[PDB]
Symmetry: D2
Subunit: 237 residues, 4 copies
């Protein structure tokens, strides 16, 4: 199967697969059963921003999520990603709905990867920033139900013509170019990712959440990865 | 055939297709017959740097090329690229040799594309910087004779095991991801490209040169585009 | 007196000093009498964005201004700034009111200056981005009526406790560090500036406007430069 | 006295103030007695590169130093800089010599500070990159023996006309603009610094080293801070 590292914004507590009894931010290393979570005071229908940072010196994957006029939630997990992920990866956004549902709308997404070598000319870099998505976004790979170009946004899960979210939906967007996250001469490897999201549900109990993920380059949506599996995992192991 | 816009560093004067009687920098719009050239005091075996700039407000494609301890050469041409190129493109480096030959070695290459919309969140961006090339550079498309990973460089044309350039060679490298250079809501579109190169020949008359180019995304090496055609053009029209 | 280069967003037509009979964007070289203007469909109370670009290859100072859901206005003027401005400058924002008035509120401001030399290690750069201004912004020089920290904004002209603009007010903010815009080894010098602004007036005829300017480092508010002189010029010559 | 946080490249072991018995990289928090060191295989007369990273989520100050064709040295120390440093600081480079001596030559220096707020428009940033230093570098504060413009380099300590280093010398360069490293609305604060250096001595035992430091804005060279005190500290406590 695929190799996955993800930061999850998990809107629905599935306590039988180790979720805490509240919406939470989590670090997922090859399992939907997060290695670390923190309470997340998710706001139905408010635009939020998530930040993800890592570097190969500290070997610590960290995330922060906030809303305007609100406190942040943060989570960190000590992991060496050179030991988890292959040398080349793709980076993406994933979302799902199940019998509970929500919009999984992405208004912006940026990513920066840097490899500094021991050469005097040391810096290797990739950066993209999306603030507008077009109907035909050729530098994204769209998987499952994901679409681009509605109000210049990326809709990771199915929305009817009237902004209403559909249940039992899964969709992903991967940046077209593979990303080099380890190189033999690199003395420092870093990455940062930012996305702004709008999770809106007509219901008191939205599901299931949004993840920023890093995968093997040929990564696809696992069968049956709607709902609690966030379009990342084939099962709940 | 392909649609090509290129800045050429043309090392060999072909006066029957309009080259001046010296090495020169030129702007090529859909023809190897440059729309503008400037004299270039090319240095056999010295590391050089070329810069290319454009923006959709000024509609002027400009290039500068220098060496350490030397004056620059510059050329500009008034062109609206929205009228020449499609909305999505690939960006690349091309080189050739013929019966005269040279190394077409790329030590570094960076590219930045920015689309600013009339949204308050206006900026869309792509950036890459290569200072080291690996044997397996998955974010480059290599065409014809181009290779990566010799001394951490990109060799656009065939070199023997002993750094010696081969004649009748053509090779290109395109960035894997397509680049969005026009968008309906963009109020300013800009791009800049930089590459450092080493053109070395055992001969007094090196050929044929290096080009930075922008093309339709499915662009390939035209048949018979060795030598004076720089791996860009099927003929000299 | 001071040496000034400015892009003006001029909200009030003073037809006796050459303004056109409408709000306009203009390029000012050492005179409030713009060298070039374009019609500007200014929107009372809407957040707008201005972009300013220049490079020493093209020697063309260009600006664009838009609002969400509106067309842009653009103006360009061929000028070599190496011939107008000294080698070191300060960059700033200026605004005024007179007997007619408006808020001159700056919500964000960014500036990037780059000097590329003919060295292999060629790039010299300055960049700042302000999205929040604090009550004590030590990296800004505030002149005249300018203040920082109200709603995290920069107020270039006097506002009462209730957001109401005061007449006969002039204020400027300069970035604390001097900026190097020419260097003897530079082969390309570029700069870009962006600011988002909110110009709001209880009146049908707001005055007087906002300017992005570049000056000698010791630049101060000229005496009597309220109203039509935009805090830039001592007189209307 | 001043408040100092520094990464030291300490070329001379002073074992009575806790140096290890070899050249080393260290993290200094308000004391020349490093909180953490690592062995550094310093190369007399070779150009080296140091990288320094920190963020307020991880609260870990990390450095790496290498040469071309050599392994890196790295050191990290868990510290919250919001608890050590004031909200506004200046960033600089410091070097010294004593009865043992070396050149303390800086060929390039870059710094990036970012404060991300919980606003949708969240990013505040400062960046500079120096690859060439001019005789009159108005955006640097030079203290003690530091000079700019010899071979386009920054010489932190006295060099005779013939590149020969002088003993008993101390010099610093601070970026002119104060840097905002904490803000009440910031959800993530990060900084990175890079400098390339050339430490050359006619002697088998060079002294005393180079430091990247962060200080109170009015920071000056302490009396008697030549040699082992690196121009940072008034004493060895
Ligand atoms: Ca869940
Ligand atoms: Ca030719
Ligand atoms: Ca006017
Ligand atoms: Ca020591
Ligand atoms: Mn969970
Ligand atoms: Mn030619
Ligand atoms: Mn005017
Ligand atoms: Mn020490």
């Amino acid at each position: 199967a695929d190799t996955i590292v993800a930061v999850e914004l998990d809107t629905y507590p599935n306590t039988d697969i180790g979720d805490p009894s509240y919406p939470h931010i989590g670090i997922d290393i090859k399992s939907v059963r997060s290695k670390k979570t923190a309470k997340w005071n998710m706001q139905n229908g408010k635009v939020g921003t998530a930040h993800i940072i890592y570097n190969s010196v500290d070997k610590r994957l960290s995330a922060v999520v906030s809303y305007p006029n609100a406190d942040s939630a943060t989570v960190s997990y000590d992991v060496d990603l050179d030991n988890v992920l292959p040398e080349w990866v793709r980076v993406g956004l994933s979302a799902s709905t199940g019998l509970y549902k929500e919009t999984n709308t992405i208004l912006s997404w940026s990513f920066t990867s840097k490899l500094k070598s021991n050469s005097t000319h040391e810096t290797n870099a990739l950066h993209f920033m999306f603030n507008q998505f077009s109907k035909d976004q050729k530098d994204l790979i769209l998987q499952g139900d994901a679409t681009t170009g509605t109000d210049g946004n990326l809709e990771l899960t199915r929305v009817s013509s009237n902004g209403s979210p559909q249940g039992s939906s899964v969709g992903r967007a991967l940046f077209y170019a593979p990303v080099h996250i380890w190189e033999s001469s690199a003395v420092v490897a870093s990455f940062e990712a930012t996305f702004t999201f709008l999770i809106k549900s007509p219901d008191s109990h939205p599901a299931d959440g949004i993840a920023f993920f890093i995968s093997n380059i040929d990564s696809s949506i696992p069968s049956g990865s709607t709902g609690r599996l966030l379009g990342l995992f084939p099962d709940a192991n």
